[PDB]
């Protein structure tokens, strides 16, 4: 659902990040919070950002004046796993 009112503010909100670079794609339901300087080229990077060496995370920059396509949306993903265990979650 749209949350432009709650998440964006004047001059843009920079508290929300996303990872732009990673050595490999994520496995399903994986979380990578490492901030290693991503090596995009043949240069070593030596732990400092620079030529072909970028910070892995990036700021969304939610301006209130942004188009619908660039407005902050909040997402909730419900996963219903059924294993060989007692089913402990049910409804009416």
């Amino acid at each position, epitope marked *: 659902w749209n949350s432009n009112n709650l998440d964006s503010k004047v001059g843009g909100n920079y508290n929300y990040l996303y990872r732009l670079f990673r050595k490999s794609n994520l496995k399903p339901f994986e979380r990578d919070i490492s901030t290693e300087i991503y090596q*995009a080229g*043949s240069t070593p990077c*030596n732990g*400092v950002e*620079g*030529f*072909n060496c*970028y*910070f892995p995370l990036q700021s969304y920059g939610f301006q209130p004046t942004n188009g619908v396509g660039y407005q902050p949306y909040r997402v909730v993903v419900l996963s219903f796993e059924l294993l060989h265990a007692p089913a402990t979650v049910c409804g009416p």
Partner: antibody
Amino acid sequence: QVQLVQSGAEVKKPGSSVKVSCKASGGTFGISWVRQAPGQGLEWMGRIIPILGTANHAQKFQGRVTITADKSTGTVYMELSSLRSEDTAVYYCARDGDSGSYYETLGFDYWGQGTLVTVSS
Amino acid sequence: SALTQPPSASGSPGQSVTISCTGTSSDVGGYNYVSWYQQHPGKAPKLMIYEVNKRPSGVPDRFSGSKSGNTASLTVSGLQAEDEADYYCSSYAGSNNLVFGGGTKLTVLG
């Protein structure tokens, strides 16, 4: 339609500050600045990737170069302060990669026209 | 300064000229980000070679880049009068450092 248009033909007294603009047209990943003294060779100054926020300086220009960009206008500014007679040169923009391909080739594809900054008393 | 490029290479039409660009292990020898620019007097530089051997879209096949140890080399094969210009080499000197050469004034003799 991938041209870089450089503004300005400014003259500045020694010790003042100059700000040169580059307007990018078409897709441009990062814009670098290269200066050339009259008669002398090329020397690198700095690089900016507006989509990422990183900026670079050559060691010799530490404390003197400020490279900014405004995405609303699509332009990139480079400010050199504490000018002296050594700085009188032509300042060029340079494209570093197309709008995609977050790679940097360190070869500058398209160059703007000259921006001559004459520093004199 | 910082690179050794011979100021004054010359050649003849049809022949081939090899312009050298000598660095050290830490700039030219170690990494593969080397560029050759051609600049006609009064005009802006134009990219001829990037990443050692890569010709960009619109550069004739005459210009061929190469590298050996600490020396990059640009070879002009199909020399014409138009090639009379200043040729600079640039290389990666480390994170946040790019180094240019002194420039070579290529003179076509014929």
